[PDB]
Amino acid sequence: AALVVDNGSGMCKAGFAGDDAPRAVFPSIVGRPRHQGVMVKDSYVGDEAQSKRGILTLKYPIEHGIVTNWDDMEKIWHHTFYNELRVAPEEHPVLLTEAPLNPKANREKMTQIMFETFNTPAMYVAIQAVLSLYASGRTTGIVMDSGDGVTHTVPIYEGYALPHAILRLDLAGRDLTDYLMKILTERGYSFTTTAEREIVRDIKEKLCYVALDFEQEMATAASSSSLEKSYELPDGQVITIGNERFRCPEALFQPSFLGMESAGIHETTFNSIMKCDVDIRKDLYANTVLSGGTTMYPGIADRMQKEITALAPSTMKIKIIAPPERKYSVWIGGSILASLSTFQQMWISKQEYDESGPSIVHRKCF
């Protein structure tokens, strides 16, 4: 019984190899009390921090894919094994996931904590973009993974990765949440605390969508009330938002809304295909796979199809593959990989790590 743990900047998906969905999906947050207790636990993790967030200061241990505090990162992993999955980590091999072009120093801490703190018998670290391609049943395609921290475009052809063509965008779900908070103040609603970030994130996941034509959608919102939607706050107060529904996801295609100089996700994907060999670009155009939670906006696949078609030659067939379960594609691909018989040769034992070190993890892995 192998464990598949997918640690992202915002959510932690964990479960067992062979299942179809993660058994445990909770926010990757650590909350600490910011008031004094007056009536006769110093930290809260995950959903227990989300239910007491009114008196807590919420912090994400992972920011932009970078672990800002490893002590809080161990609290997420300890909460995963003992509270969410309720397993003994020293009895199950664990398949971990890592971002593309992950620093070796980050992989060494992840391997050192799993073998020395949790004493897992075996371990393996897989690339998240490769697992997302396993879930779609493909060996060729460029994966655009946009989660909570960062956005990556990883081209893969016939099972071979092109690391020189991997592009990165410091713009994902958390930057869109902060942008929604900023433009919500333009409507009269003030969200400032870390507990209100989780409220705005819930507004974004429920009411935000990607407009096919942004300027026509801005004109429809200015001459009609058809695009307006209501949202009930935890205290019963109801707010109404109009063009903020499609202006927040528009920052994915126009990063200048955030004061950024980079290009949108559509040009980042196109520029990553152009960095590949000319003989593999045709298959990458027809196998553009979306992965992550930030790709779950309604209408993002039609907009992605329209923007890349305008960039690519007219004879190329642009095909955006957006599976309905792409929010868990990394975990599903890991559950598929950890169950293959040809994968059991990839496990790194704890006994092997104690005598050899992290050098065997830099090999064997990619």
Binding site: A2, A122, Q345, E355, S356, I360
Partner: protein, 393 residues
Amino acid sequence: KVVRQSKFRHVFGQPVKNDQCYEDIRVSRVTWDSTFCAVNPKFLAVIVEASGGGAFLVLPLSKTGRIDKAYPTVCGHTGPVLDIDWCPHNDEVIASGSEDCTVMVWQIPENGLTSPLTEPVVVLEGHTKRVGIIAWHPTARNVLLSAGCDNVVLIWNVGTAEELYRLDSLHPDLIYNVSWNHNGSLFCSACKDKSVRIIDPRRGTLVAEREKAHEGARPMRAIFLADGKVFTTGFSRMSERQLALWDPENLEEPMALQELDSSNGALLPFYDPDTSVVYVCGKGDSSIRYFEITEEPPYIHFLNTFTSKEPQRGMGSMPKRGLEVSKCEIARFYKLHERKCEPIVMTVPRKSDLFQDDLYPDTAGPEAALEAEEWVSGRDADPILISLREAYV
């Protein structure tokens, strides 16, 4: 548990630097599928392309870099050299088989060759066709085996130039290879009729035989293991390269049977009895796959694969006495290209910098156990084991 218990699951190959290679070497162009390379802790022997007759290049291990085109070679054969094998008890003695239907034993000076070597120590003449198989006896001194294309195996005493045994009525077709067992009482062989045979030379009888070990018509190889089993490489009926483990006490079905790929070129197995690791190097391949032979099913356990971008024309393996123990090195392979010899180091990654007792047990020494006269009487002895801790620096 989850991971199979082993010490060599993370062995990785590493080619040496360009200044530690051997360039400007006209490697031989013979279609015969031998190793072309024989190396001991002292010299490096490579079968080279001679303008006339046959010759092979003997050069010290220190003589690295570009080799002079006029470097003296061991040019004594009138036909192209087919097989070369260093004597396990004498680092300066090497036997060579050629297409002139003869076997010559040579004595190399300690500092190498200054002038071309043309006269050998002894010319063993007993075969009617070309000799492409040569295997020194592991324990008996000055005992040499030769197998020509006339389908006959001959046992020689190099010290007296005598022919100890002639085994002519045992192979009906072309012999592929001959491998002695551990102590030297038996030897196995693969033949063109797809049959693997285990033969006792001193009694001239057939101990065991398995007909059609591999169904394909492409060549096979059969080597003896330390425990007494037979590891074979071959092709299936669908032209798929296979590995097979055989129990000589029960040859009805193979203990293991794994398929590797569907490439051409014969698979040359390099067995290391100290680590029980078989290195499979295909002729024309660019990769080296190593497997661990244990007692746990499926017996043949794939470890890893060293990959490169150049196909290998030959392959030599350094014995244990010449490896750098202080760096956790368990094998060194002298990969032959078409004009260069590139050593490849196999290393076990270990954090410790001390001597690894589990990696280096007692290996066979350069001291013979018996002699040619004692072995003929029927004496059987194990190879004399030495220690490798003294080699640690």
